[PDB]
Amino acid sequence: STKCVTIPTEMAMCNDVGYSEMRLPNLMGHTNMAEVVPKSAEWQNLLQTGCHPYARTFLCSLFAPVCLDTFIQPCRSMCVAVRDSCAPVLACHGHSWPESLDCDRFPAGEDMCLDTLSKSCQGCPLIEEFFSHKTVLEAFCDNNFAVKVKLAKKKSASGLYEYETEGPVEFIKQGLLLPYDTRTMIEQWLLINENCAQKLIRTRPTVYVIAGEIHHGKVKVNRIFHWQKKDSQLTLATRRWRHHKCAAA
Ligand SMILES: [Cl-]
Ligand SMILES: [Cl-]
Ligand SMILES: [Cl-]
Ligand SMILES: [Cl-]
Ligand SMILES: [Cl-]
Ligand SMILES: [Cl-]
Ligand SMILES: [Cl-]
Ligand SMILES: [Cl-]
Ligand SMILES: [Cl-]
């Protein structure tokens, strides 16, 4: 029916939250630790960002409720705070706030609940057209990656529009990742920023030089340079990048 188990060291989410014994089944419905531990480990990437100081203990009140006490849910206030602070980070990871954590399921008003002690990647930069290769090189130095990509619009079976890279991607500045991983992050950014991709399709030709940052599986495009058919400045900047000395080391 129900039992109490020791929080294992392998459960990094709740191995240092003030108590060592949890009750099963937990508030998430998990009936055994072979289910509790991996499902809790799915939150590790979000929790390592520090999106909200109460995210970890809020989650542990659900995944590892206190053994000897009756089940007390966290307050809807704390759910709304943690959700409003951490949901954009999950969106940057490509995820969304789970329906199982819909804050409307948590108590408010008279119902007793555990409360608090007290009371980014979505940017779409402009398409730069008349620019200097010195500005392009400055963007290269200021960003993690810089690539030459051709974008293409495509109609799916359901009638919706998909935006994809077409042909090979010419890498100018690789950054600290392999070109395969960088390109995978660029595709992820294209899917997450559908409005920005749609904006980029409207400028012909659809060839761009994009520069941005990649941090812990999050991709942010900072600069977008349009590659004209008779381009000179992007050509000069890309040919110069190999021998270019940045202003900062
Ligand atoms: Cl969001
Ligand atoms: Cl973020
Ligand atoms: Cl970011
Ligand atoms: Cl624009
Ligand atoms: Cl920049
Ligand atoms: Cl189309
Ligand atoms: Cl870098
Ligand atoms: Cl054209
Ligand atoms: Cl043109």
Side-chain angles (χ1 to χ4, degrees), residues 118-143:
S118 297
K119 174 66 177 183
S120 304
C121 64
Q122 206 69 18
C124 184
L126 294 185
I127 303 175
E128 304 173 53
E129 301 177 60
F130 293 163
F131 45 79
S132 63
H133 66 266
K134 305 189 64 177
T135 304
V136 183
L137 289 170
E138 188 182 29
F140 290 175
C141 294
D142 292 338
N143 284 277

mmCIF file of all heavy atoms in Angstrom, residues 118-143:
data_model
loop_
_atom_site.group_PDB
_atom_site.id
_atom_site.type_symbol
_atom_site.label_atom_id
_atom_site.label_comp_id
_atom_site.label_asym_id
_atom_site.label_seq_id
_atom_site.Cartn_x
_atom_site.Cartn_y
_atom_site.Cartn_z
ATOM 1 N N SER A 118 9.190 33.654 2.978
ATOM 2 C CA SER A 118 8.818 35.045 2.789
ATOM 3 C C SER A 118 7.559 35.127 1.927
ATOM 4 O O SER A 118 6.898 34.121 1.649
ATOM 5 C CB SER A 118 9.983 35.822 2.174
ATOM 6 O OG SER A 118 11.102 35.843 3.043
ATOM 7 N N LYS A 119 7.220 36.338 1.494
ATOM 8 C CA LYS A 119 6.053 36.552 0.645
ATOM 9 C C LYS A 119 6.277 35.980 -0.752
ATOM 10 O O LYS A 119 7.294 36.253 -1.390
ATOM 11 C CB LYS A 119 5.722 38.045 0.555
ATOM 12 C CG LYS A 119 4.610 38.384 -0.428
ATOM 13 C CD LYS A 119 3.272 37.808 0.011
ATOM 14 C CE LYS A 119 2.161 38.209 -0.949
ATOM 15 N NZ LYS A 119 0.827 37.723 -0.503
ATOM 16 N N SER A 120 15.040 35.400 -23.037
ATOM 17 C CA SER A 120 16.470 35.122 -23.001
ATOM 18 C C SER A 120 16.939 34.534 -24.327
ATOM 19 O O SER A 120 17.770 35.120 -25.021
ATOM 20 C CB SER A 120 16.801 34.167 -21.852
ATOM 21 O OG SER A 120 16.352 34.691 -20.613
ATOM 22 N N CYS A 121 16.398 33.370 -24.672
ATOM 23 C CA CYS A 121 16.690 32.705 -25.934
ATOM 24 C C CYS A 121 15.690 33.052 -27.028
ATOM 25 O O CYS A 121 15.785 32.506 -28.132
ATOM 26 C CB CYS A 121 16.710 31.189 -25.733
ATOM 27 S SG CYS A 121 15.105 30.531 -25.226
ATOM 28 N N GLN A 122 14.734 33.936 -26.749
ATOM 29 C CA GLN A 122 13.663 34.261 -27.680
ATOM 30 C C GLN A 122 13.958 35.496 -28.521
ATOM 31 O O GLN A 122 13.110 35.900 -29.323
ATOM 32 C CB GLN A 122 12.348 34.454 -26.911
ATOM 33 C CG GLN A 122 11.086 34.188 -27.722
ATOM 34 C CD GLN A 122 10.910 32.722 -28.071
ATOM 35 O OE1 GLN A 122 11.517 31.846 -27.452
ATOM 36 N NE2 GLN A 122 10.076 32.447 -29.066
ATOM 37 N N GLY A 123 15.135 36.097 -28.367
ATOM 38 C CA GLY A 123 15.440 37.313 -29.101
ATOM 39 C C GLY A 123 15.544 37.062 -30.597
ATOM 40 O O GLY A 123 16.095 36.055 -31.045
ATOM 41 N N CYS A 124 14.998 37.994 -31.373
ATOM 42 C CA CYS A 124 15.043 37.942 -32.835
ATOM 43 C C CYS A 124 15.739 39.194 -33.346
ATOM 44 O O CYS A 124 15.094 40.248 -33.500
ATOM 45 C CB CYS A 124 13.640 37.821 -33.425
ATOM 46 S SG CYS A 124 13.595 37.627 -35.227
ATOM 47 N N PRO A 125 17.038 39.139 -33.621
ATOM 48 C CA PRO A 125 17.754 40.344 -34.050
ATOM 49 C C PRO A 125 17.344 40.775 -35.449
ATOM 50 O O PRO A 125 16.818 39.998 -36.248
ATOM 51 C CB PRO A 125 19.225 39.920 -34.007
ATOM 52 C CG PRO A 125 19.193 38.437 -34.169
ATOM 53 C CD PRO A 125 17.924 37.966 -33.518
ATOM 54 N N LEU A 126 17.592 42.049 -35.734
ATOM 55 C CA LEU A 126 17.256 42.595 -37.038
ATOM 56 C C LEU A 126 18.176 42.027 -38.113
ATOM 57 O O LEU A 126 19.297 41.591 -37.840
ATOM 58 C CB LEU A 126 17.352 44.122 -37.024
ATOM 59 C CG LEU A 126 16.338 44.848 -36.136
ATOM 60 C CD1 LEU A 126 16.463 46.354 -36.301
ATOM 61 C CD2 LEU A 126 14.921 44.385 -36.442
ATOM 62 N N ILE A 127 17.681 42.029 -39.347
ATOM 63 C CA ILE A 127 18.467 41.597 -40.497
ATOM 64 C C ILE A 127 19.309 42.784 -40.952
ATOM 65 O O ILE A 127 18.779 43.770 -41.468
ATOM 66 C CB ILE A 127 17.573 41.087 -41.631
ATOM 67 C CG1 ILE A 127 16.679 39.946 -41.140
ATOM 68 C CG2 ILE A 127 18.419 40.635 -42.807
ATOM 69 C CD1 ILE A 127 15.678 39.475 -42.172
ATOM 70 N N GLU A 128 20.622 42.696 -40.757
ATOM 71 C CA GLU A 128 21.532 43.759 -41.164
ATOM 72 C C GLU A 128 21.931 43.553 -42.620
ATOM 73 O O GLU A 128 22.320 42.450 -43.011
ATOM 74 C CB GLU A 128 22.763 43.783 -40.258
ATOM 75 C CG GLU A 128 22.418 43.933 -38.782
ATOM 76 C CD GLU A 128 23.620 43.787 -37.870
ATOM 77 O OE1 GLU A 128 24.632 44.486 -38.090
ATOM 78 O OE2 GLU A 128 23.552 42.964 -36.931
ATOM 79 N N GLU A 129 21.825 44.613 -43.422
ATOM 80 C CA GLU A 129 22.064 44.515 -44.857
ATOM 81 C C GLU A 129 23.240 45.357 -45.325
ATOM 82 O O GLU A 129 24.116 44.847 -46.034
ATOM 83 C CB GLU A 129 20.795 44.907 -45.627
ATOM 84 C CG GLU A 129 19.590 44.047 -45.293
ATOM 85 C CD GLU A 129 18.339 44.494 -46.017
ATOM 86 O OE1 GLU A 129 18.340 44.491 -47.266
ATOM 87 O OE2 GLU A 129 17.357 44.857 -45.336
ATOM 88 N N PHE A 130 23.283 46.638 -44.965
ATOM 89 C CA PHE A 130 24.403 47.512 -45.308
ATOM 90 C C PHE A 130 25.289 47.612 -44.072
ATOM 91 O O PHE A 130 24.971 48.329 -43.121
ATOM 92 C CB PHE A 130 23.920 48.882 -45.771
ATOM 93 C CG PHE A 130 23.187 48.859 -47.084
ATOM 94 C CD1 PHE A 130 22.396 49.929 -47.467
ATOM 95 C CD2 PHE A 130 23.290 47.770 -47.934
ATOM 96 C CE1 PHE A 130 21.721 49.913 -48.674
ATOM 97 C CE2 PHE A 130 22.615 47.748 -49.141
ATOM 98 C CZ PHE A 130 21.830 48.821 -49.511
ATOM 99 N N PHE A 131 26.400 46.881 -44.088
ATOM 100 C CA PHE A 131 27.280 46.776 -42.936
ATOM 101 C C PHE A 131 28.722 46.721 -43.413
ATOM 102 O O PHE A 131 28.999 46.468 -44.587
ATOM 103 C CB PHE A 131 26.952 45.533 -42.103
ATOM 104 C CG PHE A 131 26.741 44.299 -42.931
ATOM 105 C CD1 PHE A 131 27.820 43.587 -43.426
ATOM 106 C CD2 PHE A 131 25.462 43.859 -43.226
ATOM 107 C CE1 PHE A 131 27.628 42.458 -44.195
ATOM 108 C CE2 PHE A 131 25.265 42.728 -43.995
ATOM 109 C CZ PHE A 131 26.350 42.026 -44.479
ATOM 110 N N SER A 132 29.641 46.946 -42.482
ATOM 111 C CA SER A 132 31.065 46.856 -42.763
ATOM 112 C C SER A 132 31.621 45.527 -42.271
ATOM 113 O O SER A 132 31.177 44.975 -41.257
ATOM 114 C CB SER A 132 31.830 48.011 -42.110
ATOM 115 O OG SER A 132 31.718 47.969 -40.699
ATOM 116 N N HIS A 133 32.612 45.016 -43.005
ATOM 117 C CA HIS A 133 33.279 43.790 -42.588
ATOM 118 C C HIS A 133 33.951 43.944 -41.232
ATOM 119 O O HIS A 133 34.174 42.942 -40.548
ATOM 120 C CB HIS A 133 34.302 43.359 -43.640
ATOM 121 C CG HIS A 133 35.454 44.302 -43.786
ATOM 122 N ND1 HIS A 133 35.473 45.314 -44.721
ATOM 123 C CD2 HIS A 133 36.626 44.387 -43.114
ATOM 124 C CE1 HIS A 133 36.608 45.982 -44.619
ATOM 125 N NE2 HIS A 133 37.325 45.440 -43.652
ATOM 126 N N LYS A 134 34.279 45.174 -40.827
ATOM 127 C CA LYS A 134 34.784 45.388 -39.475
ATOM 128 C C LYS A 134 33.697 45.124 -38.442
ATOM 129 O O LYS A 134 33.962 44.536 -37.384
ATOM 130 C CB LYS A 134 35.329 46.809 -39.336
ATOM 131 C CG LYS A 134 36.386 47.172 -40.367
ATOM 132 C CD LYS A 134 37.040 48.505 -40.045
ATOM 133 C CE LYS A 134 37.807 48.439 -38.733
ATOM 134 N NZ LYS A 134 38.523 49.712 -38.441
ATOM 135 N N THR A 135 32.465 45.547 -38.736
ATOM 136 C CA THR A 135 31.340 45.232 -37.864
ATOM 137 C C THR A 135 31.085 43.730 -37.826
ATOM 138 O O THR A 135 30.811 43.164 -36.760
ATOM 139 C CB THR A 135 30.091 45.977 -38.338
ATOM 140 O OG1 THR A 135 30.358 47.385 -38.386
ATOM 141 C CG2 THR A 135 28.922 45.720 -37.401
ATOM 142 N N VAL A 136 31.179 43.068 -38.983
ATOM 143 C CA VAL A 136 30.984 41.619 -39.025
ATOM 144 C C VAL A 136 32.043 40.910 -38.191
ATOM 145 O O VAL A 136 31.740 39.979 -37.432
ATOM 146 C CB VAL A 136 30.990 41.122 -40.481
ATOM 147 C CG1 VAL A 136 30.713 39.630 -40.528
ATOM 148 C CG2 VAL A 136 29.969 41.883 -41.305
ATOM 149 N N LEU A 137 33.303 41.335 -38.319
ATOM 150 C CA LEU A 137 34.374 40.719 -37.542
ATOM 151 C C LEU A 137 34.191 40.973 -36.053
ATOM 152 O O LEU A 137 34.474 40.098 -35.225
ATOM 153 C CB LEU A 137 35.732 41.242 -38.015
ATOM 154 C CG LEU A 137 36.201 40.758 -39.389
ATOM 155 C CD1 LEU A 137 37.431 41.531 -39.844
ATOM 156 C CD2 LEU A 137 36.484 39.263 -39.367
ATOM 157 N N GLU A 138 33.712 42.167 -35.692
ATOM 158 C CA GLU A 138 33.418 42.440 -34.288
ATOM 159 C C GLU A 138 32.335 41.505 -33.764
ATOM 160 O O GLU A 138 32.434 40.993 -32.641
ATOM 161 C CB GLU A 138 33.001 43.900 -34.113
ATOM 162 C CG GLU A 138 32.868 44.337 -32.665
ATOM 163 C CD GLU A 138 32.414 45.777 -32.528
ATOM 164 O OE1 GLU A 138 31.704 46.266 -33.432
ATOM 165 O OE2 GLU A 138 32.773 46.421 -31.520
ATOM 166 N N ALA A 139 31.294 41.262 -34.567
ATOM 167 C CA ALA A 139 30.264 40.311 -34.162
ATOM 168 C C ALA A 139 30.844 38.911 -33.994
ATOM 169 O O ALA A 139 30.524 38.209 -33.023
ATOM 170 C CB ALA A 139 29.125 40.307 -35.181
ATOM 171 N N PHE A 140 31.704 38.494 -34.929
ATOM 172 C CA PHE A 140 32.378 37.203 -34.815
ATOM 173 C C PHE A 140 33.122 37.092 -33.491
ATOM 174 O O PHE A 140 32.973 36.108 -32.758
ATOM 175 C CB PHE A 140 33.353 37.005 -35.981
ATOM 176 C CG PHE A 140 32.689 36.785 -37.313
ATOM 177 C CD1 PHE A 140 33.451 36.705 -38.467
ATOM 178 C CD2 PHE A 140 31.315 36.648 -37.416
ATOM 179 C CE1 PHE A 140 32.858 36.502 -39.698
ATOM 180 C CE2 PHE A 140 30.715 36.443 -38.645
ATOM 181 C CZ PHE A 140 31.489 36.366 -39.786
ATOM 182 N N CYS A 141 33.930 38.105 -33.167
ATOM 183 C CA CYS A 141 34.687 38.081 -31.920
ATOM 184 C C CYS A 141 33.774 38.093 -30.701
ATOM 185 O O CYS A 141 34.113 37.503 -29.669
ATOM 186 C CB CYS A 141 35.650 39.269 -31.867
ATOM 187 S SG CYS A 141 36.969 39.220 -33.099
ATOM 188 N N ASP A 142 32.617 38.746 -30.798
ATOM 189 C CA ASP A 142 31.726 38.888 -29.655
ATOM 190 C C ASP A 142 30.791 37.703 -29.460
ATOM 191 O O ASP A 142 30.155 37.610 -28.405
ATOM 192 C CB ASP A 142 30.892 40.169 -29.785
ATOM 193 C CG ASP A 142 31.732 41.426 -29.654
ATOM 194 O OD1 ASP A 142 32.832 41.348 -29.069
ATOM 195 O OD2 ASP A 142 31.290 42.494 -30.129
ATOM 196 N N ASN A 143 30.686 36.798 -30.429
ATOM 197 C CA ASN A 143 29.769 35.674 -30.312
ATOM 198 C C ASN A 143 30.517 34.346 -30.255
ATOM 199 O O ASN A 143 31.695 34.249 -30.608
ATOM 200 C CB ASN A 143 28.768 35.667 -31.471
ATOM 201 C CG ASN A 143 27.681 36.706 -31.300
ATOM 202 O OD1 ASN A 143 26.698 36.473 -30.601
ATOM 203 N ND2 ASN A 143 27.853 37.862 -31.934
#
